[model samples]
Target: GPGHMVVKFSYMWTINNFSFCREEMGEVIKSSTFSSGANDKLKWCLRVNPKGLDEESKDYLSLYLLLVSCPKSEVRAKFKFSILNAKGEETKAMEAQRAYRFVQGKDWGFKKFIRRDFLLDEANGLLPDDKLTLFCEVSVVQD
Candidate 1:
């Protein structure tokens, strides 16, 4: 007999009071660290700039995927970020074309993932009940 099985490595982080985080430059809110499973060696977390992190990206929402644990060897992973509206619909999906190397504490993501104006607009529905839900997908490369 043959069996079909699949495993997933994905995480979801929800940010409440989306407006609570300062929109000031270089300020970021880091989500709690997580791993694919209890015994997983590598751990990760999400970092976000409610407004922007630097002068150039000040008018946009900055999001990044950060490696939070140590591994014996360099690790690479492909990641994607998307926003879920109040209706539980995925929107504004963004992803990297290829896997990126992570050497502990390193982070990679879009500096200007979305414009502040568009995200804050009530009609956009990116935020519902003043909450922003972010979904992240990570696929680790095994060497």
Candidate 2:
């Protein structure tokens, strides 16, 4: 009865026509959490133009986000997070084993929440062009 559990989710975005500036582009938001039972691991990946394009007119961009949650009493659990680009390359990563405290008398349930936001960057080495495509993936684990 000692094995790891993995959970996964994904979302896709597509841009047909480019009219707004890079700053005007909306941000990709992602959130994840866990119940108060055991430790868990979360992983995320983003892919641009997953179907593959043959025309130069079609372009795409990809982004990723990772979140983690652990029990409050245990300090040995390591929470690690990372991001993967369009080429399946990983980007920024963060890891730690810190505990968060909630209100003692409040109606705090067994849940941990994490949120990540990303924008379409031209120099991130993942974007094919100013245009966009539909490709993304996310994964999580528990142990």
TM-score of each: 0.88, 0.27
> Would you give me the overall lDDT of model 1?
0.84
TM-score top scorer: 1
lDDT of candidate 1 over 1-143, digit per residue (tens): 65433324878888887783465323778899988899888889999988786899989998999999966667778888999888777799999898888888899999999998999899999888888899988887642
Collision pairs in model 2? none
The lDDT values for all models are 0.84, 0.33
Please provide the root mean square deviation of candidate 1 (C-alpha atoms, Å).
3.9
Report the lDDT tens digits of candidate 2 across residue range 43-134: 22222222113233124222322233333432222233334456654445443344223221211111111111123455653345543443
Give the least accurate 10-residue stretch of model 1, judged by summed lDDT.
Answer: 1-10
Report residue 33 deviation for candidate 1 (angstroms). Answer: 0.8
